[PDB]
Design a protein around this ligand. Structure first.
Ligand SMILES: [Cl-]
Lengths: 267, 260, 259, 240, 267, 265
């Protein structure tokens, strides 16, 4: 749509009540924002942080006013620097982002590293500041994510770069990540939220149903039968919104056997 | 209820212009494709395939047809294999697969070689008690490693799929039933009677549901090609919803719930 | 494992406080039982039933004294007759549960109900159990695990027949098509299920957890990979080379680079 | 060598009976299916699709045709998108076509018109070409090959960007993301496209169909395996 | 004809250098690898795997061999698995049976247990004797096979029975194995090689190229790109036996650039 | 890792004894190097070359002192120009299932069968003179195995079809841009930079690298991939106490007792 709308000021309302490690805000125009708020530790998550993010995300998913989720870190220095070095419920969170019917965007300034780097990849889109830094650390610190951290990363950057990223554990700047297709765009640090909000509003103008259907379709290319469950799940929901889909329910209400003879067969 | 399911069938001939097949439609919406070459045990040649592609294309587009029966003429053979391309039966195989209406193999006598892959491709197989199944390719050198191999495994399992292909034995109806190759076995005389019952049980059901499920069961096998079928049904469904039609007429989408 | 241990009496302890639609019980020896408790309506689930079952399975999961979960219906006439779409979440949750889940089925397992039992790792059926779908009969479908996974159990011909015709199948037909693991007399249903549960409790829970993730991994693509690899990660922490990283730069030279 | 690849093409018309498409053949083996509705920016309607299915079926069955070009009339559009969904049949057809199909794109390749170019084995883009999806903007989606297969071309991050926002992408953006195979100035679109077709025509047509089936088989599961073992069978008739 | 199939078998010893296995060849193309440690019920130690790998490799490359039998010494045990008194190189042996371009038949008498059960599963076919006993033990003894021992079992018996076999670690007799499709046939113990040899001979009647392509094709439903590799390998092989496949080599002989215009372009 | 350590000279020790077509060397710090040594025929392989690469790669796998294998061609003109004028499929699986990272070091030609080999390696380090391509369709052959499907998992399906259907040659820069190689370095520095990448991987956990290698194959190789990935899990399981309990039970005569282990969520 028009830039005037897209770059309009963002109003965030606080819904962080009871959260220790994260902030949770909503805009009136449909965006929910989850902020890892541990900037002293470069926004490393600990098990509490994960549990809170799971709650915030369950909430965003169930809130009809919300159509897009942003995941970010407080400050300019880190998105998320990984698991806290000082059990593995972050897997749950990965699943939860994967199966969330609304687009989830990673708004990344500075460090996205380790468990934190898998977090941004799990998100549908990544918006990077020009100061953003990406990479894995597992093999360097005796650990690994060989699940979506591995196979899904390949589906993003190809198998030669996935092997480089994991095996060597180097760091990559924003341009390097842009070039290998690891992030969707690179924007100046001062404009990060401006542009991220723009991208969200662009999606918000589009069909929520279409967006969830394509999301599941894109997962379905990776997640075998789990993907099929999402994709058919939307198909079922769509069916219930058609007349033939409503006959069974109308039949029961009217105390009669369903009659499918009165419906056209398509080719 | 038996009375309805076992009521007689009114077949109308639709075989106009076909040499190798007969093609019939019933008033209650059953289309039957019959290979009409029992002088060569119902083996197909390219023309036979080309005509089956036509019939099935007709059935697919006919609003009155819900279920297709594929069968052979007579009692001795369903299809004993191959003898307008050398291998167009592959095309016909796909078209059974992506056909949004259930296809049922009505098998009397022999279902061998290419003829055996054909009944397997059908969503269901009703077998007469005189039915015989098996592959032969390996004997003469030929073979089917596509759905002829992989998809057979998703029916009978990997041990028996290797057995059937590697030895190329013949199996009677009882053997086929116990390994899950056919859905049921009936006395030869009642073969059509039971097939029509199965067909009618399907006709009482939601055609849109049948078509989505069939696409879903295919999608466990056909990777991105199965996804195409399944998502295409979703797209189709979408256009019948209010939200889908709102985008067409334009687009204010905020008036539709962002469901969890 | 001798019969005397396996067929010992079972002590259930009620954990049902705050549950309106379900019962939730635990045994001394590590079995968590989730019982759908709406027999007036043949044990159909509404959204409340699903939310409670999710809660109870979440609890069973995080309880270290639980090794097996039994899912069942109250009474002798129905396991679950289907819906009265959050049941998708419950399905996902049964799938990724690191402990064996057992459907214990008496009478009707139908529709959404039938998909629940299939989702469970095993199914012990009473001789009075009935199975089948009803979607196409009532204008709906389950085309996720309800379809693909059914095929990985009974094969594609049977899967197509079950769905397309929506017939009903007795315990005998279900057993013969591989749909259930075993059929026992109605009176012995819990007795025999507890036995299967106890036999699993005698085995390595870490082994069961890996194998389950591994069996899922043959159906669930990268989602199965996430589970399996996640177990590998868990195992890795429990080793010295995995511990070395957390303990100055790390040094892995003191470790074999095996073949 | 450049002189051969760049020689003039001898087109022969085969557009008999077609309202919405042109269909031409060269002596050296190229078939060209042109969408001929430039007024509506080469959008397809059920007839167009029915006619493209016919032409593509012809090309597949002609021993003289080695390569097929799919394109739009004029310099402003390739195809700006759309029984109802017989374009799904045409997708399947492009997929299983045992010969390379090359999308020659000038101007817009949008919506269903975008999926069509993706479905082609190769895409040769003019410098004025524009790409994107529109479904979520216009209450539709292609979550079949339009989704998964897009991922296999551009990666999951770009595929989600393309579908979720439905922006437009210029030729350079398309090239850079692996979406098209090359970009040429508009005046050279067909000249360069024909060269690519002629480089494939110098190669083994059996080798090409086997490789296309193999690349498909990385996506289409048992349907990929069927294409693949179909070729092995056709190979095993060529032996003793 | 039953006269040919049940004719006497002439076995030729080729066990030179082996300590844990016998290795024989018949004059009509069957290779038989026999695990020979019956005092420990044919459990394999690392040396047993090394020798089974050599023997298998030899059978694969011997053009005179069309079919391979895997079996154990005596009537009481096929193979009861890893030796408790004791690298993980049975995975190599597993992979070798998988990619073996010839049919491999597990001839099972008595126990096929743990890793020994996994070996019989990997074999294309299994001929069991009425005394045969099957099952896993991993969870009973703190171990597991999660690769082919899990996933591929599922493709034999289905997900319900696979979960049963692995989770409970019971034993199953011959009738039970037959019923769940775990084995191809059950025969009397006295007749075990009589019958097994018959099956082998029914396979020798057919084309080795055809068998090879079908084995590859059926592996291809399970093994992703690895399967495709076997499948294409055969296709590349078939190709060379054609004119168009020979046209490249004849171009380089005649010192000319290849010409492919003279070949039809089938539909 | 510091630059001084990474760019330290490399001491290679010859291990090529009995090898005709290949050299095989090992450095003290854990790199093995298989060099195709037929520069006269642009380092193309004949059957014996493949037999020796199998042996040498088998050795590197079983040598516990080695953690990374480099694959390369002699001289600066070629890496491998492919088949000469099917056991190379065995060497392919062997690179695939090698629990240690395998790096292709490419100078000059990597072509045909020689091109599939570089793609098969986990990483590819390319010199600025490197040339990549297929030739099969031009000469009436094809690799429709990992040569096709896996190629697409590197460069995308549009480039995969372009590379196969046309059989052109691509310079280093083109190879780098479609993501076919990992980096392009000046020819003079080829081994300097290559050994650097190996050392960085050698500073990391060998157990981590093999799991992650299996996990990434497992996105391609179906149940075969699951066998690699589960095999590593089984292995790690033996290294835990719960896994040792089984065998400990047998050695102490008793029935195993798993009740004393935490049933985690
Ligand atoms: Cl030893």
């Amino acid at each position: 749509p028009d830039e005037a709308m897209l770059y309009a000021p963002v109003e965030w309302h606080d819904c962080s009540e009871g959260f220790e490690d994260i902030r949770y805000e909503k805009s009136t125009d449909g965006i929910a924002k989850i902020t890892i708020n541990r900037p002293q530790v470069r926004n490393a998550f600990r098990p509490l942080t994960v549990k809170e993010m799971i709650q915030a995300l369950a909430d965003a998913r169930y809130d009809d006013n919300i159509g897009v989720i942003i995941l970010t870190g407080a400050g300019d220095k880190a998105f998320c620097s990984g698991g806290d070095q000082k059990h593995l419920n972050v897997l749950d969170f990965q699943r939860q982002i994967r199966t969330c019917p609304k687009p989830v965007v990673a708004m990344v300034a500075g460090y996205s590293i380790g468990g934190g780097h898998v977090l941004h990849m799990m998100c549908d889109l990544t918006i990077a500041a020009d100061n953003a830094i990406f990479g894995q650390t597992g093999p360097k610190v005796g650990s690994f994510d060989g699940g979506w951290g591995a196979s899904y990363m390949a589906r993003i950057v190809g198998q030669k770069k996935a092997r480089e990223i994991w095996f060597l554990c180097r760091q990559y700047d924003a341009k390097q990540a842009l070039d290998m297709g690891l992030v969707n765009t690179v924007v100046p640090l001062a404009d990060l939220e401006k542009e991220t909000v723009r991208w969200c509003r662009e999606m918000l103008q589009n069909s929520p149903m279409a967006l969830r259907c394509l999301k599941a379709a894109l997962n379905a290319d990776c997640d075998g039968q789990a993907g099929l469950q999402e994709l058919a799940g939307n198909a079922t929901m769509l069916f219930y919104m058609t007349e033939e889909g409503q006959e069974g329910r109308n039949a029961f209400n009217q105390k009669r056997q369903p009659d499918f003879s009165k419906f056209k067969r398509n080719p």
